Write a protein that binds this ligand. Sequence first.
Ligand code: AWD
Length: 460
Amino acid sequence: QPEPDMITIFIGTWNMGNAPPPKKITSWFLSKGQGKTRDDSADYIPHDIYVIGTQEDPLSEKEWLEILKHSLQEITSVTFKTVAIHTLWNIRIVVLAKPEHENRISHICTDNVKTGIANTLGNKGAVGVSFMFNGTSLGFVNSHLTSGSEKKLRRNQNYMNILRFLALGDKKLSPFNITHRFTHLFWFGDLNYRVDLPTWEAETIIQKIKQQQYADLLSHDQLLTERREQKVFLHFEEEEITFAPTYRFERLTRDKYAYTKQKATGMKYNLPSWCDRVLWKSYPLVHVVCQSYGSTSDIMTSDHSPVFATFEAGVTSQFVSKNGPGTVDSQGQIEFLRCYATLKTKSQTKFYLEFHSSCLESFVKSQEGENEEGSEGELVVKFGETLPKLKPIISDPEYLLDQHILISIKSSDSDESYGEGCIALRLEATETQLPIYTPLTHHGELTGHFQGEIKLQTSQ
Ligand SMILES: CN1CCN(C(=O)Nc2ccc(F)cc2)CC1
């Protein structure tokens, strides 16, 4: 039975509005409704992994697991295995997998982050799950961010707290936050970004939605504008939105948006918005293709509609050679040549690098680089040809060309990371000096760049 080189992943996000679901929710798992929808001919084909994020979820874990598993069984005739379930307050993530994947899945981690302080602590935050699928690390974050049209900056702060403090994946990757720990990271939820138009334009907005004319609304979507100004979700992707705003509906129909201020809303307007979103970030040159992104039309218990997204994701096998794991394979080497970091910092410490990769027995620390001034005010840290030659555990190009090297640049004075990035080993050539590049971030914000050349030796 061959190991897969591709899987499909279902991501669902639904703010349930503290109401039990209706008896049938199969349309959600089938990616049927509005937007980019799944072909009818696929309906019986199970996804490999289903990741369900809920917010304002009133059900027990048991109650929801029963509804989810019976739903999928009705669709596919497959009894899914529960990989993980984690709940913070009324924010929940469930991961289900086909039974054939049970002995492909390991290193299951769960965590949560509570956002805000005192007043603003006690209902918003995030839950997450990570695991290994054979040789591929997968991370999943379900976040319910701060509500309200005038709180986009709070949402951005919530995002940074979640990616700083959510403890998923390999704890040995100590300089790296969740935005660098996974081959594929999916981040979804009620992100609560709104369409930033005047309140007086509510009926105009509804008109546009009824005509399926989303362009002038999307140009005011706070998540798209904030992402374009690099305020949030730097280096994440989102499929094009081709479905109606998923909030705020009158319950038990989808024919009415309930946008007017009410005591129950704290006298806030809720103009129709795309609150409910799915974003991802995969390591460079790994296959990831969005195959659906849309909302259901027929699930109306909540003031939100469910959102679905599906993906093809490249995966690798758990590689064994005569040599590694358990030793290095002397036919393999990675050389980083003529590299330099360009940093936005004003600090005047020396810097060293750390190289982290599951193709190494353990992480590798460099010597200190040489600091110079850039022409436009910047710090440039030069490493020359001084960098340690990296010794991978397996030399086979079928393994090594699929790997990645995480880079941290750290202060000699404090050992703290000033920037993190990732380099793919999916090169155009081996035994050939080739340009490499990664932006560097810290707490998910741009802090600089790393560039240079690489020369990769494999057993071929
Ligand atoms: C800490 N433990 C280790 C064993 N364990 C597990 O193996 N779960 C699993 C479930 C479903 C699946 F598909 C694969 C693995 C539960 C957590």
